[PDB]
Design a protein around this ligand. Structure first.
Ligand code: UQ3
Ligand code: UQ3
Ligand code: UQ3
Ligand code: UQ3
Ligand code: UQ3
Ligand code: UQ3
Ligand code: UQ3
Ligand code: UQ3
Lengths: 162, 162, 162, 162, 162, 162, 162, 162
């Protein structure tokens, strides 16, 4: 019933392609201040990936992220769970799966910009406002959001998350 | 800078992909009573095409259609122009380009179902409630919408439309 | 553990082969007035497919059908669930999965010939004795059964069935 | 030694060639009011086939027919058994083999035009003057013979014929 | 018209496929205490062959067997003739054709496990309860049937059986 | 999420590799009187296979076995379930899956040597101290353990095990 | 009449080659203190690109830039519009197009050295003397100009520039 | 009798594969607080290498390390010598060989995290708690261990170590 797939636009077949459109749709509905062409541009950007959450063949949530292996971290671009399936643990399950996928790729730091509506969920996911990654390593790589709060999560590679 | 392109999923691909994502977004917003997943599935269906209206590199309108050359007609699936570009003649220019395209393919009949709000636009584009195409030729081919009005446009192949 | 597989003799696989034999066995036991070699011929006909119901690796039911995309409908040939798995919702889930599969293929009409003993099951699956598909479109394509009654089900492509 | 072969010109070829010459000769002699050139043109037509009755390596009878699978029927073009082999059941065995062949191809309707002398043979083979196939389905496909009688045979796919 | 074909699932053919299904049907009807899926698995096992008895194109009997050339014997798995063709010498002709086939392959011993109901048929086909093949050569190769009795037939390679 | 995979070194490979490393670790911990190097050499031996019990992507149990198809039996080399997953039926489900796998390969005899602590588990899985396979067939093929008890399981190919 | 092309010397055909010579000519005339062999070396350097401004097929302006994706910024090398076409908005249109091209490549920082004659135009283009890119990230990558003023423009990827 | 091989999982043959399993075994026994799946994941990670110490064909020690040539250093992941072969100089010989291998690859800095039980051996190997590699160069690349002590060894490329 529940699935997890790290998908993305390569160079993709139709089932993954419609999953990406669903992801772009959910991100738009759940993040109205983000321009939909901006969401669509990043979701289909080849350097971006999306951990998709599938229920009975249908997208119900996902995390869009940008891996920076040469810089040693991943940027969290979009997080969303559809309106009626929220407050059920799916958001935590998504982040946990993202953490397990990243320790398997030996990337141990997440960076993200959270506004006031979002900061609480990231704190529950283990993110902090104390940033260990040096500014010279993320500035110009992650996209800055003025007025938002930069937040960082450090992963433990000896711990299982799923 | 105004452009018209007949595009669609098959089997510039990345720019066609984002165009198809932009068309699915414009269609979904302008046709809110249509399911978004239904729109996406048809927009990316291999047997469906979309005439995209591109302005300065961005999607601002389109007509999704499904050609039935073995039956002698084309089904008009979705028509939409983004709100800020409406009442400028783009919907008329879109339909005229679609007519010229189908005359080149010896397809001279458009079929569609218009609800109470859209009937007036199709009337202004030459559509009629009198259907010359026999029911045995379109039933089970076009998608029926109960309580909507079946409309037909017959194209003149000797007339220029653009 | 229950799965749904649209299988059929191509040109195949041993796991698919033994499922087809199991389907031929179940159909024949549940339809004793059908000739076994007639069931075998259709189940193994390359133009026929069967949606197999697999519980714990073994066949327990299925629906054999013939798609007529150029005609706009699909003919339902055999429906059966093994006797010890009947009256559990398996026949209904089979029909619903078949409806979803045909929506993705833009075939929106089912036609079938029901016994006096099976006509009740088809009425519950939404079938009606009112046939919208013209006779000139199904006669000579679906297999006629003198004495039985033609039944038709129209599918809504904007609705999810599974 | 009795043999039945479905043969025909395309795109043992030399023995099939002489069989086709023998069939054209038998057809011409048994159907004297048919033009010989007309018989030869259809016997060697790529879209036409002939079920040849071979006895000890020699043609003694045949049924030339044209399959219309897109229309759901087959046109019976010529039927003949050489004089010395008539009234032995070969004409009945020929038609029965043709029926079994068409059931394997999901073609369950024969159409033909019988003059006053041939109607009786087709009646004994199950043909009828009542035509279930709609006129819109056969007009302009089968060759019409004015003042002859259109006859139809419906085949039962559950019955063995050989 | 009666023929003998040593067939079996290779790696096949549709005519061979439907014969195998017919054999699976006949074996199962004539051996009701055998699980159908067990019969199906062995009939379609690539190490198993079946000598099919074909009367007028359709299966009416057969013998399924497993050759063990490195062990020096063949195991007889299933023997059946359809009920309306029994008591006609068909089962005896099947056994004789099987014996001839194995002489050409230099396998001179048959082993089998006979019911109290079938043991009489095997005695008539020359089988004996005296087993010359050592236990160390058949145990773990032939399928044991607790309660049944092992029976053995030795073939003379200088004798014609058909 | 429970999975069963038959894996093994030869000639997903990296995930099979880590599975084989996980199996060697589980085997070594659960069988401390076995040399770790001996376990690793057999787990990675080309002629040895392992049925791996995967739970949520991680090895939690397995049966290492060596098939002797030319001799008619399989040697059970190592059986283990990790401590935290014991007494849940996994050892029984592992053996049942191994039995179903071997019936598909016409191997109907398991052989193993059980010490005083493991005899009871094999008894509950149908093994017996009475050995039907002749000594001439297994001596020098299975690895002997002096002062351990040779045990044999005979599988019924007509019974379902999963 | 007006065009925009991001061109450059690869490893270029003749129309682009003459565009590059025109660009080198305009940069020389508009930047007399820059050695012409230095301008020519950079314009034809493969790691450099030039956004060319074409009027009726003729180069009238351009920006030569060096992308440093691994460093997260682009260096602005040469900017010029021909003498008679200046003070018409072309310089702003060029920079805006450069910004749109760079947000599409996820590079969000421009760096440049402006002398006293040039600082005012860059201030109107959104450049600032407050430099957010760390010195350790641009020193040795961009070419230093003593006495000139380092200037930086940060791009917003959610804003359209053309 | 004594050997040294820099081995690792590529994309490895069986002798190297069993050496890697032995290395994973020794690291587990000698570092019990390190999860064995974590040790196995890193030892078989393609970006990791292990300098293996072989005595008479058997693994008796090794250093697992991660080269970061783009960062200018190597991370020391696991060091171990089997229990009975310790305090014999093998640990120093291993590190010396690692140093010689790294000056040949022009990497002149080692970084590692040592707990209280390990700090003394690294001090004897020339490691120091004064860290010359800037934090911006190793943070997020080497795996941090809270409570452990970061330690650094600088190599001299003009000195022979073996
Ligand atoms: C800014 C941008 O550029 C980025 O970087 S990405 C954009 C991020 N923008 C959004 O995503 C907005 C739309 N939102 C959603 O789509 C979903 O809302 C979530 C956020 C995906 C949660 O997914 P979800 O609802 O499945 O979460 P789940 O069920 O795991 O529970 C969550 C546990 O966090 C607690 N909590 C505290 N504060 C919040 C909060 N603000 N939102 C949600 N939960 C919160 C809650 O109270 C429970 O904690 P508990 O009840 O256990 O104490
Ligand atoms: C399957 C089936 O469901 C479909 O296929 S979904 C198609 C229906 N999709 C929508 O409903 C989406 C929301 N809508 C729009 O996206 C745009 O509205 C349009 C419809 C694309 C017009 O495009 P547009 O605004 O560019 O039109 P354009 O400027 O060419 O002028 C058009 C001339 O028709 C006059 N007119 C009269 N009645 C209507 C009417 N109901 N709607 C629009 N115009 C109308 C108008 O007043 C002017 O009249 P004129 O000035 O010529 O006398
Ligand atoms: C057209 C022709 O060539 C074919 O293709 S052969 C089709 C007919 N194939 C057979 O004859 C084979 C033998 N049979 C079976 O293999 C099974 O019988 C089912 C039905 C095929 C499997 O379905 P199943 O047993 O899993 O049923 P499921 O539980 O899903 O639905 C149960 C709900 O159907 C209601 N109902 C009403 N009338 C009937 C009826 N006549 N038979 C069964 N249920 C009926 C019942 O009153 C309940 O209604 P509810 O409980 O909802 O109130
Ligand atoms: C496009 C359209 O123009 C055509 O497609 S051209 C087809 C017409 N081509 C000819 O006309 C050629 C000359 N003819 C022949 O080549 C042979 O004559 C036949 C027609 C091939 C019979 O073959 P055949 O002689 O082997 O027949 P067979 O032995 O199977 O028996 C048949 C049973 O039908 C009885 N019967 C009743 N009325 C007739 C009749 N008019 N003709 C033949 N039999 C007839 C017969 O008395 C026996 O009756 P039963 O004994 O069963 O009661
Ligand atoms: C080992 C096991 O895993 C297997 O592989 S399953 C083998 C057993 N499969 C069945 O049970 C299926 C159901 N059965 C059949 O499908 C058919 O029954 C036959 C026999 C398989 C076909 O053979 P058939 O019927 O064509 O017989 P045919 O006419 O050739 O020989 C007839 C001569 O057998 C004499 N006779 C003595 N005892 C028996 C006996 N028990 N049954 C039949 N005949 C017997 C009879 O008295 C006459 O003797 P005669 O007339 O010579 O004096
Ligand atoms: C070459 C030769 O050396 C080998 O091949 S090495 C194989 C021996 N490898 C070990 O020794 C490793 C340590 N052990 C384990 O890794 C697990 O222990 C098991 C053995 C994998 C059971 O797996 P498991 O714990 O999942 O078993 P599962 O839950 O299926 O139940 C099993 C039912 O057998 C009952 N039972 C009675 N006696 C024993 C016994 N001695 N051991 C286990 N169960 C036993 C139990 O009480 C329950 O009885 P029930 O509840 O059915 O009445
Ligand atoms: C240093 C080097 O290593 C680099 O890094 S690259 C080398 C840069 N060296 C040159 O390029 C010298 C030659 N120059 C030209 O080739 C053209 O002159 C431009 C600069 C390409 C403008 O192109 P253009 O003339 O098309 O500009 P446009 O029409 O967009 O107007 C421009 C708006 O900036 C206002 N403005 C303020 N100060 C200046 C200024 N110094 N120059 C031009 N405009 C200026 C103006 O007053 C209007 O502002 P407004 O009037 O609206 O307030
Ligand atoms: C933390 C982790 O994430 C890492 O980063 S890796 C994990 C490191 N964790 C271990 O490896 C624990 C298990 N351990 C071993 O597997 C072996 O124990 C060694 C460490 C490989 C030595 O190998 P080895 O025994 O062959 O050493 P060798 O014979 O060269 O002598 C060594 C010379 O260091 C002196 N010494 C002082 N303190 C220590 C100490 N703590 N351990 C060993 N020697 C020490 C000793 O007294 C003699 O010095 P001397 O006697 O000459 O003054």
């Amino acid at each position: 019933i529940i699935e997890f797939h790290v998908i993305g636009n390569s160079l993709a077949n139709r089932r993954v392609l419609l999953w990406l459109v669903g992801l772009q749709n959910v991100f738009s509905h759940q993040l109205p201040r983000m321009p939909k062409e901006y969401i669509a541009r990043l979701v289909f950007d080849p350097k971006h990936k999306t951990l998709a959450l599938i229920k009975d063949g249908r997208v119900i949530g996902g995390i869009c992220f940008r891996m920076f292996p040469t810089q040693g971290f991943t940027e969290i671009v979009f997080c969303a769970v559809t309106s009626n399936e929220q407050v059920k643990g799916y958001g935590t399950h998504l982040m946990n799966h993202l953490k397990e996928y990243h320790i398997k790729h030996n990337i141990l730091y997440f960076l993200t910009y959270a506004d006031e509506y979002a900061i609480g969920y990231f704190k529950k996911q283990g993110f902090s406002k104390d940033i260990k990654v040096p500014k010279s390593r993320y500035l110009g790589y992650i996209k800055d959001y003025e007025g938002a709060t930069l937040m960082e999560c450090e992963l433990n590679p000896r711990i299982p998350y799923t």
